[PDB]
Amino acid sequence: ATPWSGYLDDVSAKFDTGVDNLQTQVTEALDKLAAKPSDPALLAAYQSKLSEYNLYRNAQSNTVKVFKDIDAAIIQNFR
Amino acid sequence: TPWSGYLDDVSAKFDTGVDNLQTQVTEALDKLAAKPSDPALLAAYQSKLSEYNLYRNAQSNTVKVFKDIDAAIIQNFR
Amino acid sequence: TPWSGYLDDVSAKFDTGVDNLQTQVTEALDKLAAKPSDPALLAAYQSKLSEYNLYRNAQSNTVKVFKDIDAAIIQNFR
Amino acid sequence: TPWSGYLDDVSAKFDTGVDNLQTQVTEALDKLAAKPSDPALLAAYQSKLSEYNLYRNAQSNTVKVFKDIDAAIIQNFR
Amino acid sequence: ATPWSGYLDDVSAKFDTGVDNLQTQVTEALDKLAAKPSDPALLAAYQSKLSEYNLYRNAQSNTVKVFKDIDAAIIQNFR
Amino acid sequence: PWSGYLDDVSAKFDTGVDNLQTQVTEALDKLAAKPSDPALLAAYQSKLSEYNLYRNAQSNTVKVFKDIDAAIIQNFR
Amino acid sequence: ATPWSGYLDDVSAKFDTGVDNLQTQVTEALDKLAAKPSDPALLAAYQSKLSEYNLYRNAQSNTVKVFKDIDAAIIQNFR
Amino acid sequence: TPWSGYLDDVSAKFDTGVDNLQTQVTEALDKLAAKPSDPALLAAYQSKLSEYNLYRNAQSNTVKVFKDIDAAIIQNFR
Amino acid sequence: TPWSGYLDDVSAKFDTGVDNLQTQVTEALDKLAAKPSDPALLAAYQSKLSEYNLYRNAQSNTVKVFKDIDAAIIQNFR
Amino acid sequence: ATPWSGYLDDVSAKFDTGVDNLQTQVTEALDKLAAKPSDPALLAAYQSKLSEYNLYRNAQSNTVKVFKDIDAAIIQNFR
Amino acid sequence: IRVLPRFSADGQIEMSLDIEDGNDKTPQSDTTTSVDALPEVGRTLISTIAR
Amino acid sequence: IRVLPRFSADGQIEMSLDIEDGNDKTPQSDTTTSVDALPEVGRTLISTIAR
Amino acid sequence: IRVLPRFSADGQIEMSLDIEDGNDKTPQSDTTTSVDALPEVGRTLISTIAR
Amino acid sequence: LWIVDLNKSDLERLGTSWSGSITIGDKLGVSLNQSSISTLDGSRFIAAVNA
Amino acid sequence: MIEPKEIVDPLTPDASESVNNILKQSGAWSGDDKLQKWVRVYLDRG
Questions:
Q1: Is J9 helix (H, G, I), strand (E, B) or coil?
Q2: Which of A37, D27, E57, F76 gives a 20 to 30 Å CA spacing to F33?
Q3: G62, E77: Cβ pair inside 8 Å?
Q4: Which sign, positive or negative, has the C-alpha torsion E16, E20, E23, E24?
Q5: What is the DSSP string of C5-22?
Q6: Closest CA to A70 of B51, C4, B43
Q7: How many CB atoms are closer than 10 A to CB E45?
Q8: How many helices (H) and strands (E) does chain F have?
Q9: Helix (H) or strand (E) holding N17
């Protein structure tokens, strides 16, 4: 059936389903810019997508780390 | 609910001590996920997540302390 | 608010401490966008945006400091 | 995908603030190139080209300053 | 008291109230000059005025940048 | 009220730093009104860091005296 | 009671009392230059004052953090 | 084929984007050196060389931004 | 009578080892604070502040390790 | 009586006793240049001296910091 | 669509149902009255039990 | 497609089925002629059990 | 002012007092008009007991 | 569930404002309801009307 | 200066009875409206 998925997987995937298609949009913007690097409207378009992508990946991974640290501290008190 | 001990009571007193943080943090999570570049949403999330972290840590150490007191008394029945 | 921790209280002090800057910067942006070449509108927006930047930075660092103090105390219950 | 973050919005405000400049700048170019030695066309072009220059510069600097506000918050999540 | 203001707003307003009316003086002397572009008195006036307005806005924007730098340097040391 | 030895060793710090517990709040609510004033920032930095060290040293001292007592009580048996 | 002051307070205050009047000199020279933004004497004065002020605030804030990092390092060993 | 990374793919997209500039810019030089005082030649070389400049700078900056995204994620595996 | 143990005898070796650093630090600071703009002053204070840092870290770490050796031996008297 | 010097002090002193005379050469240069600013023979010399001074101070500071961090890293492992 | 069906003795069918349906919210951006020939519908979520 | 076959004595074949199909999202296909040249076939996913 | 009053048996009142008063040591400005118009009082603090 | 909202509003602005300036004899400037310098050295009046 | 009082009796006139005087003397009233009646009836009369 569907592959198994924990709690951290879900907290991660809430971003991949929140930013609807940014992962495609960035590759489209790069394929258009590489065609003619000297178009102001293309450079202006690409700057925004690249910045948004950067921030998205940062917020995702920092949140996964924080939850992994809240869990390990409880698991340690079982002993 | 049907059966609960003293440790369960100590624990539950935090789960009701914080009224709604348990939902607020999941709510803010997806508000942010919809628009991860909004400063207001980021600032709103950072504090709710910090408060959730401290809530869980404070909850667990207390239950351990009480377990060690009770085990220490029970050891002397013999 | 349904529930507000100490950290929330700290953050809210900054928010209520700056009256209307949140909207002032928003309006200034639209004005400048209407006439990107007027020196007066430029000199206004430079100020508002700098102020906003410092507000957010000061806000976010304090919350962290207070988080670390609490985490350190909570650790010693063990 | 009509997905547009906060930075996209901040940039779009300029695009929609300068409604027609985007094309006026090309109309003027084509009619100048049709007859380069006319003072009325030279004087018109200068005034349009300069406005377009300042438009794109303010557009890109605003975006960068917002990005630097977000990244400093996200760093504190740890 | 005023709608709101930080310390930088204040530093800006100190210039805006230090040059009492230069903004309107420059705004109108142009409306004189444009209507008779070839009078040497009108020219020499407008030259003298626009040089002042230039230097004014220049030093105004530089001072704000220096105070923003000084504040960022301290806020960074809290953490 | 009733107060043990550890409560005493704790209160020593409270009564030691007379006023800092207030000063950090008054400095905070001054700064929050005007985040961009260097004279407010430079003060707040020192007050907040002093409060930090205060709480840490208090908590470690109480921890050590607890563990000396638990070590002695383990030998009555 | 007299306002309580610690060791970091002491170290910080040494700078404030070390610079007798700089803290006000930089305010006066601003009100002057703002009154007459286009005089080179006033400019040449203000450049100096604003530089000295910037260096003072940086050296202060760095030194306080260096001390805080020693105290925090020693207190860790009480355990 | 030799092993190529994701940063290599990104880099190569530019090279394969500008199919022929890489050599057009050299031929232009070889011609212009023959008669340095021909304005028809100069007007062409100015364009080709400006294009080359923008191409190389966009390339390097893009590569660096992706390097710093990856490094930031790899940091948290610990 | 001023009583000194073995750990005291240990830490004291550092204090006597650095003859006057304790004073020099305060003298250098008092100079610098009068004239925070002379590079010779700044370079001197940088050097003596960092020697004063390493001094006390090495002191407190070495005082801790002997405590752990003693507590380990004492625990085996039973 | 005479200063206790550590190791970093020895490192700094190597630079101080390396540039035997620059410390005063710079000052004399400035004094005469300021006496007669419009002489290109004075200017051409002062430019060199000031640049040498800048490099000297910069290298000295950067070096000291590196040794500080090596020592700190070794000390940490005692615990 | 997610569903879980159950057969009654009466031949009634009972099922647990939830449905998300709609279109993606516009990007806060321009469009034309002809493109509004690509029609808006809301975004709707329903979750219930029915027999 | 992923499948598991089971044989029933009635001569019936039973399978657990998951299916994914479609073109990959290219919503910014630039020219009208490219869309005219290439059929849009929406990305679809199905999961069920059938005999 | 902070105070805590006590009634003597002899019809006397005893108080423990803390008093602070003055203008503040503003860094912002001094100027002839200000010194002319607005008095520089000191700043003073006292703590004592009296009956 | 029935939800109902109703609104009415009525608004009216009407009248005039004034300001201006004269100069007499290179002795006297006069200005009325201006924060200006009366810079023109010649008589100006400015009405404002809205309805 | 502080001046407390014991309260045992409700207001006279009623709140509603008083509000209307203000509303009508101001002209803010709207019960004269042809339409809002359908809703306001439930609030004022009930």
A1: helix
A2: E57
A3: yes
A4: positive
A5: -HHHHHHHHHHHHSSSHH
A6: B51
A7: 15
A8: 3, 0
A9: strand N15-24
d(CA G67, CA G11): 9
- Residue J41 in tokens: 């023979």
Whether residue B7 contacts residue B31, with contact meaning beta carbons closer than 8 Å, is answered with no
For B5, phi then psi, to 5°, come to -95, -170
Tell me the C-alpha to C-alpha distance, in Å, between residue B73 and each of B61, B63, E59, K19. Answer: 19, 16, 77, 57
Q: For residues G6 and G9, give the distance between their C-alpha atoms in angstroms, rounded to a whole number.
A: 5
Residue N13 token pair: 């602005």
User: Is N34 an interface residue toward E (CB < 8 Å)?
Assistant: no
Supply the DSSP symbol for N10: -
Q: String of b and e for M8-29 (b: at least 16 CB within 10 Å)?
A: eeeeeeeeeeeeeeeeeeeeee
Q: In the structure encoding, which two tokens stand for residue I6, read together?
A: 């073995």
J29 contacts I46 by C-beta, under 8 angstroms = no
Q: Which of the 8 DSSP states describes residue D46?
A: H
- Are G46 and G33 contacting, i.e. CB atoms less than 8 angstroms apart? yes
Chains within contact range of chain A (3+ C-beta pairs < 8 Å) = B, D, H, L
- For residue D20, how far is the Cα from the chain centroid? 11
- Partners of residue H54 in chain A, C-beta under 8 Å: 37-38
Among C40, C51, C57, the residue with its CB nearest the CB of E9 is C51
CA distance A77 to C74: 14
Question: Do C5 and C70 touch, CB atoms closer than 8 A?
Answer: no
DSSP state for residue C36 in the 8-state scheme: T
- 3-state percent helix, strand, coil for chain H, nearest multiple of 5: 85, 0, 15
| The one-letter amino acid at M2 | R
The DSSP output letter for E19 is S
Contacts of G70 in chain I (CB under 8 A): 53, 56-57
Which residues of chain D approach chain K closer than 8 Å at the C-beta?
1-4, 8-9, 12, 16
Neighbours of F28 (CB within 10 A): 18
Distance (Å) from the C-alpha of residue J72 to the closest C-alpha of chain I? 7
In angstroms, what is the resolution? 3.3
Of C67, F54, I53, F30, nearest in space to J67 by CA: I53
What token pair was written down for F48? Answer: 């907040």
- Residue partners of M4: CB distance under 8 A and separation at least 6: M15, M16
Q: Are J68 and I54 in contact (CB under 8 A)?
A: yes
From the list J2, I35, K26, C21, the residue with the least C-alpha distance to F34 is C21
DSSP lists the bridge partners of residue K22 as: K43
Backbone torsion region of residue E54, taken as left when φ is above 0, otherwise alpha when ψ lies between -120 and 50, otherwise beta:
alpha
Q: Which of G16, G71, G76 has the most F C-beta neighbours within 10 Å, making it the best mutation to test the interface with F?
A: G71
Phi and psi at H34, nearest 5°, equal -65, -45
- Long-range CB contacts for residues A25-33, cutoff 8 Å, separation at least 24: A25/A49, A25/D1, A25/D3, A25/L28, A26/A50, A26/A53, A28/L28, A30/H10, A30/H13, A30/H62, A31/H13, A33/H58
CA distance M20 to M1: 7
Which technique? cryo-EM
Measured over the CA atoms of residue M2, residue M8, residue M13 and residue M19, the dihedral's sign is: negative
> Which residues of chain B lie closer than 8 angstroms to D74, CB-CB?
42
The whole-angstrom separation of Cα G76 and Cα I71 is: 18
Give the CA angle between residues K30, K33, K39 to the nearest 5°: 90
Answer yes or no: are the C-beta atoms of H21 and H48 closer than 8 Å. Answer: yes
CA dihedral angle for residue D20, residue D26, residue D27, residue D33, rounded to 10 degrees: 160
Asked if residues A37 and H55 have their Cβ atoms less than 8 Å apart, the reply is yes
